[PDB]
Nucleic acid binder design. Structure first.
Ligand SMILES: [Mg+2]
Ligand SMILES: [Mg+2]
Ligand SMILES: [Mg+2]
Ligand SMILES: [Mg+2]
Ligand SMILES: [Mg+2]
Ligand SMILES: [Mg+2]
Ligand SMILES: [Mg+2]
Ligand SMILES: [Mg+2]
Ligand SMILES: [Mg+2]
Ligand SMILES: [Mg+2]
Ligand SMILES: [Zn+2]
Lengths: 187, 100, 142, 141, 185, 55, 62
RNA sequence: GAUAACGAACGAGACUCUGGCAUGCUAACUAGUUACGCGACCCCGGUCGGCGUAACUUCUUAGAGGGACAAGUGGCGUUCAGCCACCCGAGAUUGAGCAAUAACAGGUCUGUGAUGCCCUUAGAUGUCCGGGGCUGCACGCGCGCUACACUGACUGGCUCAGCGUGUGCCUACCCUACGCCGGCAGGCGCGGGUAACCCGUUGAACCCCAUUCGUGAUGGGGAUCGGGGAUUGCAAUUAUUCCCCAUGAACGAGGAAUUCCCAGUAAGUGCGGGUCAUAAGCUUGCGUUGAUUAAGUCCCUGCCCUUUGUACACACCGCC
């Protein structure tokens, strides 16, 4: 291509391609079991895969709410006509995905269930899935005006060292209420 | 018959697995090839503050990004290479191809 | 048809002094020019301790050509003394007996170990929040 | 075997100066007396013929390395400015005092700019530039 | 030439150590001699590896002080080198005997400290490090704001210490160091 | 006319022109390597972009 | 201070208890053997383990 | 190792990165050395980074593998954990990153289209266009710069670096060789480069060798405040930056008090980036010149365990 762009700008312009594609698909597919993307560039195709759970409810009316995203993303990054395709595949071993469990918490909380209930409703699910340890941490104002940070931990959990990169998982989600704001950290 | 195929990427081992794949299938199909020539890696440097505000002892983060680059020259025709630059390509890797 | 090319390197800080040894006359030149018009003229005998410790008969039959890269003004002297010392021992190694090498090695070592052992020392980085590698900034109270 | 490289290159210009004085076809410019040679020096040259020395220094940088010395003559003859605030950067030389010199050394025949820029020298001038070196060599012990 | 060692046209032998106390902790002889007074260093990583550095090198390393001299050893060798020429042509002796005499005549034997103070004696290595720091500072103050090179200061200070003519901050601070610890010993 | 006065300053150049591409604030822009994003959001999206604290 | 940790002390013994006949006295021999009698991920932990093993086969022969 | 305790967990350590060892391996017309033939010259040579290519990887480059572990030898110790000394060897403490339970009313609503309540909302606390201020000055403190000179300022000459960045989304703003016009700031034409391919082999600084030089603020020192030329821009007045007008002022080695620091370290010393149309007395990194002292203690200011005492538990900034 004659735009004759360097290499450093290229590895950045595609790091930003992945980052805008995740912030935009997160801020919209949150309640529908969203878990991230993984892009694949070919000789003139691009197969973006939504790593969701409810794949039937993320197509809408027979691929409607996906064929809308097909012409949105083209009109955004300026792609050619039909160089993108969207597969919406389910995530296996659903117990170990953090934003996948945090959305089920920020809608179990919104539906008015109490906190000590739903913390055990996540924690029993992710001890059932076959993991080792968890550190579900909730903060924000609770049945008062002074704040207080709760926590629920069992199992085994490491904090320091390099192996935090490729063992553990980390998730943060704000959740809103009419009275205030609660926050969730998962480890 | 002067074709240079550049392999540039971040992931060292998967880039090594593609440059040795793309050499072992050339060697197992009988065409003379040069070596897996390794160019020096480039780095990036970003040093910011680890603070939204200005409060705290003055402490700074840092960020890097390494990048590698390899190039391979051949002596072959220019049609079977579309197949050759397709056998077990790996994600992340940015392959350039020049026939001129 | 002799091809007795003995290529020896040597390092100080960033001083990649490469000596070289052929067979012929006994003469030494560095970057072409001889040993006189080399740098600091206060440092003259540091090219003669390879001569004066051993003698000037030891350098009979070996001619020398020296490449130099990198470094400051002093390290390009401590890399071109160690280089031609390691090239003398490596010429008596490969082309003549291994036994008369041991006296020459012993005499050079019984004077200074730097002749044969490089210096495993370099400069050191600068941590954040200091004007150097160890020194921190001026801390003031009240 | 004698050349420039065995002569302790400090008084090679203290006799090449006197040779380009004695022959004296160098086209000294009009404005010789009233220049600073830099933007960092503070005084004029102490020596009354400061032009022949710089023609001999240039004629040996040119003997030694390169056919591409034009602004690399100012990159080799700068120095240290003194701003009264912090040590100043290696400041450039002067463009005119060397453009006028190389056009003044083109008046006789020792330099010839051909390609890839810059001024290179000729073997005919290399004869002269090489014979007085063996002279100084034998006359100095 | 078996092993003659000019220090820039001097000789290593004909050196005679008078005291028995400073016998091995002062190395200015056969094995411990080098054509020049310069080395690559690495003489402080161990504790008593400093007592093998020649006293010529330790004078060179302790001559440069006060800011505008940190990093000039190749320069401060030259002062010593003219200093032994001047001493050779003003006294007419071996100046490495003169210097070993000046170290002896300049080293202290006791010092006062805090337990109102009380006095003890000194170590020989303490006495070397003190006599060197003393007479080098006394040469520098006498060459500060004075038309005299530091070589001619060190020459006369080494002379009036191997002479004891009370023209020496080196001997002069020895009585104040002894008489204080004498009243209170 | 106000359609000739409404934007009648040069906002061609200078850092009073640009802004963040995430927050649209005008303070602290890492203009290097074409990022043009605020350093807060750069620290937030550094992991997914690819910068990492090795040393 | 070079003090061997309990993760070392616990693995020197089960290796002795199971391969007492195969082990020896030289350091570089059992240094190659623990690689193929045990899943040790690195090299430094290898040389530390065999370095304390050859200190026990000396204390045992005493 | 002793034992009414036994077995497990995180934290430390382990780990990843960088730093010096490999003549053995992996390879190179986008990096290099050794050979032959051009040349030019000095009577065999010296040459390049001006030329040409034959063999090769020691140097340059980055990948895999080894390599060092208190292993050996003595000394010391319940003959346990270990410490000191020594040989052999490139190394017998390299340097940072990540980091615990519990908690503070530490700071940030002036980073956010993360946000609850309160005020204002068309005569606007929303938004745009012209100005001017955030830079004012009897005093006081904190961070830094040039200095107080002969180990020294001034003219020549001489010869050596390592990390980097660099033609843009809206975006108009790149590093620049090489030819000329001028004191100089620069200009006018010309070419390369999306980068080990050009800028560049990045002829970087004191230090190096020959030159003039005070006991008085001297050629040391070069500041508040005075005449003229060019560049960025729609615009420089309160002077945006640099050369060419000067006052050539205080300062003769610093009081009580106090910070930092143990080996390529303190200090000296220049470069790169960041901020950036204009731009370094700040900061973040790199190199080069390279030391003196120490291998120890609880006196000072503080921390860590065991025992003790208590009228304190918003906890000695206590209570009374
Ligand atoms: Mg000044
Ligand atoms: Mg310079
Ligand atoms: Mg002095
Ligand atoms: Mg643990
Ligand atoms: Mg832990
Ligand atoms: Mg709070
Ligand atoms: Mg608010
Ligand atoms: Mg103050
Ligand atoms: Mg004054
Ligand atoms: Mg103190
Ligand atoms: Zn924000």
């Amino acid at each position: 291509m004659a735009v004759q762009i360097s290499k450093k700008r290229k590895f950045v312009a595609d790091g930003i391609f992945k980052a805008e594609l995740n912030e935009f698909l997160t801020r919209e597919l949150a309640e529908d079991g969203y878990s991230g993307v993984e892009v694949r560039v070919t000789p003139t195709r691009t197969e973006i895969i939504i790593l969701a759970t409810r794949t039937q409810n993320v197509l809408g009316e027979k691929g409607r709410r996906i064929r809308e995203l097909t012409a949105v993303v083209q009109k955004r990054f300026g792609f050619p006509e039909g160089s993108v395709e969207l597969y919406a595949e389910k995530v296996a071993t659903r117990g170990l995905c953090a934003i996948a469990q945090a959305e089920s918490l920020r809608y179990k909380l919104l539906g008015g269930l109490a906190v000590r209930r739903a913390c055990y409703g996540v924690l029993r699910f992710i001890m059932e899935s076959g993991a080792k340890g968890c550190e579900v941490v909730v903060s924000g104002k609770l049945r008062g005006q002074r704040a207080k940070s709760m926590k629920f931990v069992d199992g085994l959990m490491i904090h320091s060292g390099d192996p935090v990169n490729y063992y553990v998982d980390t998730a943060v989600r704000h959740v809103l209420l009419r009275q205030g704001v609660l926050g969730i950290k998962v480890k | 018959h002067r074709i240079r195929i550049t392999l540039t990427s971040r992931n060292v081992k998967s880039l090594e697995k593609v440059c040795a794949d793309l050499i072992r299938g050339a060697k197992e199909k009988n065409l003379k090839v040069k070596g897996p020539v390794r160019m020096p890696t480039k780095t990036l440097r970003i040093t910011t503050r680890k603070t939204p505000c200005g409060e705290g002892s003055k402490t700074w983060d840092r960020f890097q990004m390494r990048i590698h680059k390899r190039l391979i020259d051949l002596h072959s025709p220019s049609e079977i290479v579309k197949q050759i630059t397709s056998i077990s390509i790996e994600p992340g890797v940015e392959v350039e191809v020049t026939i001129a | 048809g002799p091809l007795q090319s003995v290529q020896v390197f040597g390092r100080k800080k960033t001083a990649t002094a490469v000596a070289h040894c052929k067979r012929g006359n006994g003469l030494i030149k560095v970057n072409g020019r001889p040993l006189e018009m080399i740098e600091p003229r206060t440092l003259q005998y540091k090219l003669l301790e390879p001569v004066l410790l051993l003698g000037k008969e030891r350098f009979a039959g070996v001619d020398i050509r020296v490449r130099v890269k990198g470094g400051g003004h002093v390290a390009q002297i401590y890399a071109i003394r160690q280089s031609i010392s390691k090239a003398l021992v490596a010429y008596y190694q490969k082309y003549v007996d291994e036994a008369s090498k041991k006296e020459i090695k012993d005499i050079l070592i019984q004077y200074d170990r730097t002749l044969l052992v490089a210096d495993p020392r370099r400069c050191e980085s600068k941590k954040f929040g200091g004007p150097g590698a160890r020194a921190r900034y001026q801390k003031s109270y009240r | 075997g004698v050349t420039v490289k065995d002569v302790n290159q400090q008084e090679f210009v203290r006799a090449l100066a006197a040779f380009l004085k004695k022959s004296g076809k160098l086209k000294v410019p009009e404005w010789v007396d009233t220049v600073k040679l830099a933007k960092h020096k503070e005084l004029a040259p102490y020596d009354e013929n400061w032009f022949y020395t710089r023609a001999a220094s240039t004629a040996r940088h040119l003997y030694l390395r390169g056919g591409a010395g034009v602004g690399s003559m100012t990159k080799i003859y700068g120095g240290r400015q003194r701003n009264g605030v912090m040590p100043s950067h290696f400041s450039r030389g002067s463009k005119s005092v060397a453009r006028r010199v190389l056009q003044a050394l083109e008046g006789l025949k020792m330099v010839e700019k051909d390609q890839d820029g810059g001024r290179k020298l000729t073997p005919q001038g290399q004869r002269d530039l090489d014979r007085i070196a063996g002279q100084v060599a034998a006359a100095k012990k | 030439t078996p092993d003659i060692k000019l220090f820039g046209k001097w000789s290593t032998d004909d050196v005679q150590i008078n005291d028995i106390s400073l016998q091995d902790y002062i190395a200015v002889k056969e094995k411990y001699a080098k054509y020049l007074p310069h080395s690559a260093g690495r003489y402080a990583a161990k504790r008593f590896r400093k007592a093998q550095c020649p006293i010529v090198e330790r004078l060179t390393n302790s001559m440069m002080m006060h800011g505008r001299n940190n990093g000039k050893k190749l320069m401060t060798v030259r002062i010593v080198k003219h200093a032994f020429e001047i001493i050779h042509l003003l006294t007419g002796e071996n100046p490495l005997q003169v210097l070993v005499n000046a170290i002896i005549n300049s080293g202290p034997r006791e010092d006062s400290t805090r337990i109102r103070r009380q006095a003890v004696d000194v170590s020989p290595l303490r006495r070397v490090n003190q006599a060197i720091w003393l007479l080098c500072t006394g040469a520098r103050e006498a060459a500060f704001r004075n038309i005299k090179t530091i070589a001619e200061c060190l020459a006369d200070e080494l002379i009036n210490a191997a002479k004891g003519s009370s023209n020496s901050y080196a001997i002069k601070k020895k009585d104040e160091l002894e008489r204080v610890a004498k009243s209170n010993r | 006319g106000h359609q000739q006065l409404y934007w009648s300053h040069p906002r061609k150049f200078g850092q009073g022109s640009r802004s963040c591409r995430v927050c649209s604030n005008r303070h602290g822009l890492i203009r290097k390597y074409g990022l043009n994003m605020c350093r807060q959001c750069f620290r937030q999206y550094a992991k997914d972009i690819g910068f990492i604290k090795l040393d | 201070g070079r003090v061997r940790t309990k993760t070392v002390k616990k693995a020197a013994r089960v290796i002795i208890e199971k391969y007492y006949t195969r082990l020896g006295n030289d350091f570089h021999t059992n240094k190659r053997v623990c690689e193929e009698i045990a899943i040790i991920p690195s090299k430094k932990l290898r040389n530390k383990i065999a370095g304390y093993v050859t200190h026990l086969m000396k204390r045992i022969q005493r």
